[PDB]
Amino acid sequence: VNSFSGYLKLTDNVYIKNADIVEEAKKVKPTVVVNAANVYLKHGGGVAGALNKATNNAMQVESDDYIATNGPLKVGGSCVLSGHNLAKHCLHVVGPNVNKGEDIQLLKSAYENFNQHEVLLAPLLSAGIFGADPIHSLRVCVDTVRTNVYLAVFDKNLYDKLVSSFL
Ligand SMILES: OC[C@H](O)[C@H]1CCCN1c1ncnc2[nH]ccc12
Numbered sequence: 001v002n003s004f005s006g007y008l009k010l011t012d013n014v015y016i017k018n019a020d021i022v023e024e025a026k027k028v029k030p031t032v033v034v035n036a037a038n039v040y041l042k043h044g045g046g047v048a049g050a051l052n053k054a055t056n057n058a059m060q061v062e063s064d065d066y067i068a069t070n071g072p073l074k075v076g077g078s079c080v081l082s083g084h085n086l087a088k089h090c091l092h093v094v095g096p097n098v099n100k101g102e103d104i105q106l107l108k109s110a111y112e113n114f115n116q117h118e119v120l121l122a123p124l125l126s127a128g129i130f131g132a133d134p135i136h137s138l139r140v141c142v143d144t145v146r147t148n149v150y151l152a153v154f155d156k157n158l159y160d161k162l163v164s165s166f167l
């Protein structure tokens with residue numbers, strides 16, 4: 001039993017809700033919140049910009065030190081950093097950005113990072129300003145993640161389209 005509330009159950013391990021991931025993290029304080037990161041951990045917009053803003057830019061300061069030490073992530077890769085005031089940890093995961101011409105096949109590799117964590121609050125990878133089809137992202141999530149994932153979806157038309165179309 002966990003403290004996530006109001007989610008629709010899609011499968012044995014995947015749950016979905018129309019929600020703002022920032023406000024959800026602040027309420028639940030999950031062990032792991034997933035960020036929709038880029039390889040430079042430059043948290044400008046989308047989920048990343050919103051999470052970072054909620055940390056008063058502490059996420060960005062920590063991220064800049066991470067990059068200075070380790071260099072950029074790989075597309076499809078991840079790193080674990082602090083969750084600041086939002087969660088114990090933040091798993092920064094890089095899905096392919098179709099608006100950069102990156103390979104959508106890397107979306108499965110990106111979701112594989114979730115399997116290293118028993119429970120996660122997450123967005124749909126490569127959706128929104130990353131330019132992939134969210135219905136596709138949900139399908140890859142369900143077919144790749146085996147740990148317990150609570151998916152937040154900010155928009156309502158999306159969310160309703162994702163639910164109604166789920167196979
Ligand atoms: O709503 C659309 C999608 O879900 C993803 C892609 C674009 C933003 N977005 C978010 N999901 C969840 N929480 C969020 N907070 C702020 C943004 C956000």
Ligand SMILES: [Cl-]
Pocket residue numbers: 036045046047048127128129130
């Ligand atoms: Cl985004």
